[PDB]
């Protein structure tokens, strides 16, 4: 009795990583909202030295 409008299913169709998903593209993820990726836990690996005894 009223004009049809898009719903959550339509929005989820239009809101994937890419249109027409494949295996690799389904393995893909959408980018972060503020384009800032979470920092990686890179280990500093400071040099270790033996100052002495000789």
């Amino acid at each position: 009795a009223r004009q049809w409008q898009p719903d959550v299913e339509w929005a989820e169709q239009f809101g994937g990583a890419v249109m027409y998903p494949t295996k690799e593209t389904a393995h893909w993820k959408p980018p972060p909202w503020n384009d800032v990726d979470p920092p990686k836990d890179t280990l500093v690996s400071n040099l270790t030295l033996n100052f002495g005894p000789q």
Partner: protein, 98 residues
């Protein structure tokens, strides 16, 4: 055309092929990029000296200046990438997808 120009152009071609074929390091590709401009400098000065283009002798100096400007830019990008990922590997520059 003498064979010296042949060797210089071959050197430029080798340096260009080296840049277009990465292995692991962004630093090695920067080194290949610096070699291309070295070959360009040598070719340009060999052409200019042979033909006695007196006013053209200042062109290779400007070429070197902008070569090392590009080198500085590449080193800055490399240090930022290294700080981000822990290694200068080009495999980590894959967040953006074509």
């Amino acid at each position: 055309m003498p064979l010296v120009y042949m060797n210089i152009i071959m050197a430029f071609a080798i340096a260009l092929a080296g840049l277009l074929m990465y292995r692991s390091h962004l630093m090695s590709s920067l080194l290949c990029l610096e070699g291309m401009m070295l070959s360009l400098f040598i070719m340009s000065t060999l052409i200019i000296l042979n033909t006695h283009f007196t006013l053209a002798n200042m062109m290779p100096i400007i070429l070197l200046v902008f070569a090392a400007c590009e080198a500085a830019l590449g080193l800055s990008l490399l240090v930022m990438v290294s700080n981000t990922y822990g290694t200068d590997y080009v495999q980590n520059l894959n967040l953006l997808q074509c």
